[PDB]
Design a protein around this ligand. Structure first.
Ligand code: CU
Ligand code: CU
Ligand code: NA
Ligand code: NA
Ligand code: NA
Ligand code: NA
Lengths: 620, 620
């Protein structure tokens, strides 16, 4: 009966039937996005109304539609025709992944470029790459994908080892036409294979690893009710899943004695972009919004027990829609388990003689997705002491190129003749805050150094300063690692026992933000990525930092347009948007399959509790 | 037979006998430090010579001595009398911990200050605090401790809850005299107790935590030979222990095929300081060099199975000397175990159809020490993929004060009337590098942003720049998080298969460094803490960033004097010194016992290997 329950197969089937009965889902239509809408503010009526939002693509070239359906009442609430030249194209369809290669295989320009390189067309894979917005006027309002080619020597061969540099093609996937084929010159196709399961490359497998057995003989300490409601060590939350964002956390709260205290209303990774820093015209257009353009939830992996998730695992199997509105289950797509996390608190006292040790643990909610060459793990952690942490784990195969004769300032060499262009992976966490309720504010906290002098005669004093962000126009902030800058989200109307406002402190990793020139296309389309922290006033329709339709959108949508409203955020219903990313200069050790690298952020209580919240943890 | 073996009880007994026979260890002498010296460069003679370095204190006021003994040959190698007004006092003795309180209890000034506050002297604990060097000319050349008072309501009471503010005393612990008693005014003694095992404060203990069982049914994957030589998943190293530094790692190397490749010759935490930022004259002198003044190894805890270390644990029990030269074993003082560490590498390929997942794990070497109110865990981690990481875990009880009427800019309030002064915990890691041998150099790597224009027409390009540090005078470096600054240690004479020098990249956390005014006493005594990275040319006697005798040393010793030699470090035997720290603004949640907070650094391979070094890891 919870409004935050996962979508069920029956709900998706009903959406299909409603759209069919309304005349919106004929044979030429494809569902590009389908997801459940969150309850509006003030759902204290408890009148169940499950609403779904659908993006409908038309393969015959008619305008696509955005539709909102009530599955409870069996009605279409609104349907609007989209002008994609204005507001953006729809996300990439899975069925379009193979279209780029198929169309190019019969194009005489493509075939002539392959013949010059003595490449058999049957062996050439073409990646279906989002196009962005650049100088090609004919692409405005057309659904375009670009293609880069990789050779597969045999069906199980890793094509990433064999990039075909100097060659790129653009395709209109609706009219089924190749618009441009660009050949800037012949580069040798790197010949070494990258087959990480080939014994010739791995050598004999290690025999030295002894098993690590992790079991819970009495079962786990958390409970799951209503399909997706979790209770664990005073935490309470709902685990949602959306085909665009992936795992979404709702209603994160902490049971402090008798009171269930809210902390975060909704937490998600609302966008992620991979900009490339190679100025070659073959690749200088590459910026993949893995979330906004491709939808990371739909490519979530089925996670295997003992391999992907180790220990006493509870799985969720979310249901999504296929392109025709049929339900599709992602079996074992979400892993949930608790983990030991070392020492929580420890002291041996020289005067009382008491020796005290307690252990920590964390609840893990995770999924893993695969977008072409990239594989990303998304991990949310809840700790006994009130800390919330997010971690992204980046792995997969690096996107490759040729390595030019005489080297490169923008590409790493991985193997003879094989390069990997510099790039970033930049995430946006959208944190709809609810610190003890919805009346919240954000303060920026810097360390303050003090000069030796009167009142500081020994030159040892240091302090801190807090600046309240009062309006959206002043709430676009940069990191400053040297001054220890953090941000505090507090509730000015809820005080702890010392009469101080309760709060949580956001600790960033202070990694570089978007490196591209501020006048570039990507700086305008991924404006969120140029600053570490944004604060907006909550609004139902302000969901993504890049806007609703990211694919081939010209720029400025999302956060820069939201904050122009200059709304009051001092003790209001607010949303924190945190940018954080990895800057990847590929190393030889990343090849032929990359070991995990990580980035994230965490939030820690800051006078939220009246004392340590883990005094009642028993001594193991 | 290894020269890097742990000291044994018999070796310490022999040092005692050698010193006794030489006339250096009569009844008035105390051993303040005793440790084994590392083999000199060029120990390829394999002529065993175990040498020990001893600091000898004299309780009758005679000059202390530094002595070097050969335990193999039964001889004194050198003995020098120390002028402590010039070169510094010896470290604090454990037997001096109780002397400050005992001396003050019969001083009429102290007793009058306690009587004004209606405090029973039998209930007043006095902390034995290092003195530093300030304006008191009478302290030059005298062995001084300072005392701050805390009330214990009963023997098992936590005295930290009841600081006696406004009062400080200075004591000469050799002549047994109170030099000064300073009373700046009466502050209420905070009355709330801080007894974290009292059921009245904890409430009922949780019954919701189910056990997590971690076992290795075939035993661990590492082997221990010769007492302290570890081999694990291609890593090879020796685990040392020193009473000042604690756990020391020697001869860290990696078996790459047929070749044992060195990476780090010696790794240690060579100093750690806790400067306080409260300008009150009661506390403005407080800077505790927990390593250099107190010796963190001698207060290492005995670690309890299932509580401090969980899983299949192998213990080392290091032996140290007491003040009379008798061996004392720290039972179960070092924990060693391997841990699962999530996903190592993962990819599901859209064209080959291959799905691949491998798990990571890490080897953990850890100890925990207690210095008064503080408890610190020191963790070294080795990962399958070649990563080396250090982590400090800070816990214990915060050092307290009164919280003044009308608040404070330099103190946090924790409970009614109870404050916690701002402070930092700053560590120095000394990394004697040996990347593929001893010919190493350090490069500083910054991200380079590029302007949109010719050759970068779309404004997307970004690059990197590396600057070689060629001499010691240019090798004092600051962090720059915004430009992604890292440091690479490479071997210019050892190239990977792409003809690039092999290297390792140091990733810092980029936390603030020392905040005190640069003209302060602590900035001169802890000069290492003002900069993130130092590189020196190796020298046998340059062991600590603060010098050999830190206690009451006037300043400038250690790193600033070493780098003045301006030695060649471009392809030489070099040592990297990395400063990293926590800046602690105490929160209510830190009281009455603090949950762990962490800081550290890591080193990752950077073209050290010819490809990923974990291709031979089996599929679980
Ligand atoms: Cu990458
Ligand atoms: Cu602290
Ligand atoms: Na537009
Ligand atoms: Na909010
Ligand atoms: Na001096
Ligand atoms: Na060295």
């Amino acid at each position: 009966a919870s409004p935050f329950r996962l979508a069920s197969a029956g709900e998706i089937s009903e959406v299909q039937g409603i759209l069919r009965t309304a005349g919106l889902l004929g044979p030429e239509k494809r569902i590009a996005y389908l997801g459940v809408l969150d309850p509006a503010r003030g759902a204290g009526s408890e009148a169940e109304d499950r609403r779904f939002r659908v993006f409908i693509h038309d393969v015959s070239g008619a305008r696509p539609q955005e539709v909102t359906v009530s599955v409870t009442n069996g009605t279409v609430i609104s349907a609007v025709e989209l002008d994609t030249a204005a507001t953006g194209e729809l996300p990439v369809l899975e069925e379009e992944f193979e279209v780029v290669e198929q169309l190019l295989a019969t194009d005489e320009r493509w075939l002539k470029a392959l013949a010059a390189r003595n490449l058999d067309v049957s062996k050439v894979r073409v990646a279906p790459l989002s196009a962005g917005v650049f100088e090609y006027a004919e692409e405005r309002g057309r659904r375009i994908l670009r293609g880069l080619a990789f050779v597969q020597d045999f069906p199980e061969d890793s094509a990433w080892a064999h990039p075909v540099d100097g060659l790129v093609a653009y395709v209109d996937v609706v009219s089924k036409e190749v618009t441009r084929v660009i050949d800037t010159g012949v580069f040798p196709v790197p010949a070494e294979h990258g087959n990480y399961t080939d014994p010739e490359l791995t050598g004999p497998l290690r025999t030295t690893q002894k098993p690590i057995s992790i079991t819970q003989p009495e079962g786990p300490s958390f409970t799951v009710t209503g399909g997706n409601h979790i209770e664990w060590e005073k935490w309470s939350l709902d685990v949602g899943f959306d085909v665009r964002e992936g795992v979404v956390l709702h209603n994160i709260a902490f049971r402090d004695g008798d009171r269930l205290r809210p902390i975060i209303n909704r937490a998600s990774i609302a966008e992620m972009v991979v900009p490339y820093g190679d100025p070659s015209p073959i690749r200088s257009w590459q910026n993949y919004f893995d979330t906004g353009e491709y939808l990371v939830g739909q490519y979530a992996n089925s996670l295997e027990l003992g391999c992907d998730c180790l220990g006493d695992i509870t799985y969720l199997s979310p249901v999504i829609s296929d392109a025709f509105g049929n339900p599709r289950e992602i079996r074992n797509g979400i892993c949930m388990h608790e983990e030991d996390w070392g020492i929580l608190a420890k002291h041996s006292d020289l005067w009382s003689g008491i020796n005290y040790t307690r252990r920590n643990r964390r609840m893990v909610i995770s999924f893993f997705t695969t977008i072409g060459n990239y594989d990303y793990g998304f991990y949310w952690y809840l700790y006994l002491d009130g800390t919330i942490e997010f971690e992204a784990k980046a792995t997969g195969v690096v996107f490759t190129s040729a390595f030019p004769e005489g080297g490169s300032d923008n590409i790493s060499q991985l193997a003879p003749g094989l390069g990997a262009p510099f790039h970033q992976h930049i995430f946006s966490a959208r944190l709809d805050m609810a610190i003890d309720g919805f009346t919240n504010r954000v303060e920026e906290e810097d360390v303050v150094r003090q000069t030796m002098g009167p009142g500081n005669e020994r030159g040892n004093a240091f302090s801190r300063k807090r600046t309240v962000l009062t309006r959206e126009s002043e709430a676009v902030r940069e990191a400053d690692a040297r001054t220890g800058r953090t941000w505090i989200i507090s509730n000015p109307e809820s005080k702890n026992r010392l009469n101080e406002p309760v709060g949580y402190k956001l600790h960033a990793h202070n990694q570089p933000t978007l490196l591209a020139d501020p006048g570039s296309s990507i700086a305008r389309r991924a404006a969120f990525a140029t600053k570490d922290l944004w604060v907006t006033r909550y609004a139902d329709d302000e969901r993504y930092p890049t806007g609703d339709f990211v694919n081939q959108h010209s720029g400025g949508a999302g956060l820069p347009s939201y904050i122009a409203q200059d709304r009051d955020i001092d003790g209001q219903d607010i949303v924190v948007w945190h940018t954080f990313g990895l800057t990847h200069f590929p190393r030889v050790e990343d090849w032929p399959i990359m070991p995990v690298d990580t980035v994230g952020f965490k939030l820690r209580p800051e006078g939220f509790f009246d004392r340590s919240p883990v005094l009642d943890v028993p001594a193991n």
